[PDB]
Write a protein that binds this ligand. Structure first.
Ligand SMILES: *[C@@H]1O[C@H](CO[C@@H]2O[C@@H](C)[C@@H](O)[C@@H](O)[C@@H]2O)[C@@H](O[C@@H]2O[C@H](CO)[C@@H](O[C@@H]3O[C@H](CO[C@H]4O[C@H](CO)[C@@H](O)[C@H](O)[C@@H]4O[C@@H]4O[C@H](CO)[C@@H](O)[C@H](O)[C@H]4NC(C)=O)[C@@H](O)[C@H](O[C@H]4O[C@H](CO)[C@@H](O)[C@H](O)[C@@H]4O[C@@H]4O[C@H](CO)[C@@H](O)[C@H](O)[C@H]4NC(C)=O)[C@@H]3O)[C@H](O)[C@H]2NC(C)=O)[C@H](O)[C@H]1NC(C)=O
Ligand SMILES: *[C@@H]1O[C@H](CO[C@@H]2O[C@@H](C)[C@@H](O)[C@@H](O)[C@@H]2O)[C@@H](O[C@@H]2O[C@H](CO)[C@@H](O[C@@H]3O[C@H](CO[C@H]4O[C@H](CO)[C@@H](O)[C@H](O)[C@@H]4O[C@@H]4O[C@H](CO)[C@@H](O)[C@H](O)[C@H]4NC(C)=O)[C@@H](O)[C@H](O[C@H]4O[C@H](CO)[C@@H](O)[C@H](O)[C@@H]4O[C@@H]4O[C@H](CO)[C@@H](O)[C@H](O)[C@H]4NC(C)=O)[C@@H]3O)[C@H](O)[C@H]2NC(C)=O)[C@H](O)[C@H]1NC(C)=O
Lengths: 208, 208
C-alpha cells in the first residue's frame, strides 16, 4: 500500500512579512487503478478549506504521487496551530491522518559569530568564511550570506544540530576568491529566526 | 507488508587497524504469525557465511524486528566490494535483495582547519572551538577532539554536507570553560578518512 508524508512551512516564509507560507501534504505510492485521493484539511481541528490539490503528477516506481498544499498565516504557524491533513482514499480501508504543527519548547535566541579563515588556508586560491549560529530553539531558521547588499552564490549551510543543552547550532561556510578577503572587503551572515528581534539579525566579518 | 534496510560499516572500523567493521541488515516490520526470516549474504555475489542473525528482538508497532550482521575485512570495504544481503521470508511472495558497497568516485583528501572562538564569544562562561574539515570524498569520515591525549566530552559534529564542487565539508564544535582557552591550553581535531595518510591526521589549535 501507500504511506503519507507531511511537511511544514519554510522558515523564511513565516518569519517574513509578505510571504506565502504553506503546508504540503505529500501522498506517495498510489495504485493506478485506484489513483484518486481526497484531502480534508483542519487548523486546530477547525476544518479550513484553502486547500489546493495539485493534479496528479507522475513517477517511475510504476506508482504515483498526489499532492495538496494549504497556504496559511505566518502568525498562525508561529503561535503553534496544529494542521491536520486528512487523506481519504478509496484503495485504503481507512484514511491516513497526519498532524503537525510548530515545535513546542521555549524559543531561544541564536548567538551569531562569524569566523575568518584559518591562517593556513591562505595557501589556496579560494578561502572559507565561517558563520557560527548556536544555541537556538526551535530548529527552524534561515541563513544567508551577502556583500554590498548583494547575495553571495558560493556558500553552503550545515543543517541544525542538536547541541548538548537541548538547543541547536549550525555553521554556514562562505567561499570567496582569496583576493577579496584580503583587500579589506566586508561580508555579512544573515540569520532569520523566531527568537530574534524583528526575526532578523546580521553580523559582519572582515579584515583588520 | 515489511521493508528492508541496509547499513554500512563505521568510518573508524574500516580505517583503523584492529577493528571489526560490519554491515548490518535491518529487517523492520515483521508479522507475528509469520515472524521468521532467512538471510543469505554475498560479497561481490560470492556467497560468504560469516553471518550472524541476532534473534528476534521486539518492538511497539505490534510488529517485529529481525537483524543480521556480517563482519568484514577493512580493506574489503575500502576496495569497493559489494555486499548483497538477501532476505528470504515466508510472508513475502519474493525475497528482498538490497545491495550496498562503498561510495565510488575518486577519494579526496580532507583539508583541516581549526578555528578559535569569535572575539565576542568571550562574554560567556564557555567558549566554542571550531574544526573545519572540507573538500573530501567519499562522505565517510570520523572526527574527534582531545587535549592532553585525553578525549573531550563536550563536542558535537555536523554531518558531512555536499559542497558546490561535488566534495564534502563539515564542522565539529568543541566547547570548553572560557578559563581553559585563555591560559595557553592546546586542543586537537582528529580526522580519520580514506584519502588521508595513514588514514589519519590531527591539527592543533590554541592561543598566541
Ligand atoms: C516508489 O515510490 C516513491 C517515488 O519516489 C521515487 O523513488 C524514490 C526511491 C526516490 O528515488 C525518489 O527520488 C523517487 O521520486 C518513493 O517515495 C519515497 O518514499 C520514501 C519512504 O518510503 C520517502 O522518504 C522520506 O523522506 C522524507 C523527507 O524527504 C524529502 O526529501 C527527500 C529526498 O531525500 C524526498 O524524497 C522527499 O520527497 C522529501 O521531499 C521534500 O519536499 C519538500 C517540499 O516542500 C522540500 O522542502 C524538501 O526540500 C524536499 N526534498 C526533496 C529533495 O525533494 C523523510 O523525512 C521521511 O522519513 C522521516 O519519517 C520516517 C517515519 O515516517 C522516519 O523513519 C525517518 O527517519 C524520518 O523521520 C524524520 O526525521 C526528521 C527529524 O529530524 C524530519 O525530517 C521529520 O520530522 C521526521 N519524520 C517523522 C514524522 O518522524 C522519509 O524517509 C520519500 O519521501 C519518497 N520520495 C519522494 C520523492 O517523495 C518510494 O521510495 C517507492 N516506494 C517504495 C517504498 O517501495
Ligand atoms: C515500528 O517502529 C520502528 C521505530 O522506528 C521509528 O521509531 C520512532 C521513534 C519514530 O522515529 C518513527 O519514525 C519510527 O517508527 C520502525 O523502525 C524504523 O523503520 C523505519 C522505516 O522502516 C526507519 O527509517 C529509516 O531510517 C534509516 C536509518 O535508520 C538509522 O538511524 C535512525 C535515526 O537516525 C535510527 O532510528 C535507526 O535505528 C537506524 O540506526 C542505525 O542502525 C545501524 C545498525 O547497526 C547502525 O549501524 C547505524 O549507525 C545507525 N544509524 C545511526 C547512527 O543513527 C534510514 O536509512 C532510512 O532513510 C533512507 O531510506 C528511506 C526508505 O524509506 C528513505 O525514505 C529516506 O529518504 C532515506 O533515503 C536513503 O538515502 C541513503 C543515502 O545514502 C541511501 O543509502 C538509501 O538507499 C536511501 N533509502 C531509500 C531511498 O530507500 C529510513 O529513514 C527507522 O530508522 C526505523 N527505526 C528504528 C528504531 O530502527 C518501524 O518502521 C515501525 N513500524 C512501522 C512504522 O511500520
Amino acid at each position: 500500500g501507500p504511506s503519507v508524508f507531511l511537511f511544514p512551512p519554510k522558515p523564511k516564509d513565516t518569519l517574513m512579512i509578505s510571504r506565502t507560507p504553506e503546508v504540503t501534504c505529500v501522498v506517495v505510492d498510489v495504485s493506478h487503478e485506484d489513483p484518486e485521493v481526497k484531502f480534508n484539511w483542519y487548523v486546530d481541528g477547525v476544518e479550513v478549506h484553502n486547500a489546493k490539490t495539485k493534479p496528479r503528477e507522475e513517477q517511475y516506481n510504476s506508482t504515483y504521487r498526489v499532492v495538496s498544499v494549504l497556504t496559511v498565516l505566518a502568525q498562525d504557524w508561529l503561535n503553534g496551530k496544529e494542521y491536520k491533513c486528512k487523506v481519504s482514499n478509496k484503495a485504503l480501508p481507512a484514511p491516513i491522518e497526519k498532524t503537525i504543527s510548530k515545535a513546542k519548547g521555549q524559543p531561544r535566541e541564536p548567538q551569531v559569530y562569524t569566523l575568518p579563515p584559518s591562517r593556513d588556508e591562505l595557501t589556496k586560491n579560494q578561502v572559507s568564511l565561517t558563520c557560527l549560529v548556536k544555541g537556538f530553539y526551535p530548529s527552524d531558521i534561515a541563513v544567508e550570506w551577502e556583500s554590498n547588499g548583494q547575495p553571495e552564490n558560493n556558500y553552503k549551510t550545515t543543517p541544525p544540530v542538536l547541541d548538548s543543552d537541548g538547543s541547536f547550532f549550525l555553521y554556514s561556510k562562505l567561499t570567496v576568491d582569496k583576493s577579496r578577503w584580503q583587500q579589506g572587503n566586508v561580508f555579512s551572515c544573515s540569520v532569520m529566526h523566531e527568537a530574534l528581534h524583528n526575526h532578523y539579525t546580521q553580523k559582519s566579518l572582515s579584515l583588520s
